Amino acid sequence: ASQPPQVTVDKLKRLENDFGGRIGVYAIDTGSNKTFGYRANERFPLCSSFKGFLAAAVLSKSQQQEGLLNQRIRYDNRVMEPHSPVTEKQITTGMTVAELSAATLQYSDNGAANLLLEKLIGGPEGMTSFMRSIGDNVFRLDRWALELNSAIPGDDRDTSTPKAVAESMQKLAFGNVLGLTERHQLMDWFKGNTTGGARIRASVPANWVVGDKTGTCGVYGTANDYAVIWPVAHAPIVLAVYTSKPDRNSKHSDAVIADASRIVLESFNI
């Protein structure tokens, strides 16, 4: 009862032509295992979207280190990265590992990301190692939170593919790589994300539940979102939407991400 894949491709190609850039998508119906991709194996910059996987890496570490989420981290006199809305307010108090993970995912706090990378996960190399450990052989993180957003065409640093992002989200949300407590916590963090209102969330009816993480590099019209979507009385759908434009000076488009998401989700004829 689903739409022919070529219909969906044809719609995405027209949207690409309107956008003036590249759109890559992959979606997984976790109940039927039906999938759909377009440019699904092309690399796109992750931008800040890696932070959802960073939070997962922290939870995986906590599953083996009792009490890790409650550990308090202080960062007096640290120079805080731009776009650190939570960490810049908690210097006097410090923040727990859980609070840092929630902030990095839900507010895209760069300071929280670099604090977790430095102090728990082992830098970009350790982030990449975590993804390898769940069978993602595509993801790579090469640089720290600010520098990874250059989004230069042809530069494979700090990239993944829509398929790999969606497949890794599926593993983390519903597979065995995290325990029940950790899955539930990860999903609750994604559900509370605050930066995705104009992207995948804008593509679904208001009574569906979404958990997501966005990325906005700020150059090369490059922006993205990936999500778990719970339709009414239907198995969850995992979706990744990544975009870029050839011109350094172009702006990204939230609306194109929302429209691509709508096209892909409608193709499952839920």
Ligand SMILES: C[C@@H](O)[C@@H](C=O)[C@@H]1NC(C(=O)O)=C(S[C@@H]2CN[C@H](C(=O)N(C)C)C2)[C@@H]1C
């Ligand atoms: C490198 C980092 O600084 C960015 C990562 O990609 C941050 N993460 C994103 C994101 O999309 O998640 C924004 S965009 C910002 C978060 N939402 C705001 C927004 O959508 N507005 C103001 C409309 C703007 C950061 C720069």
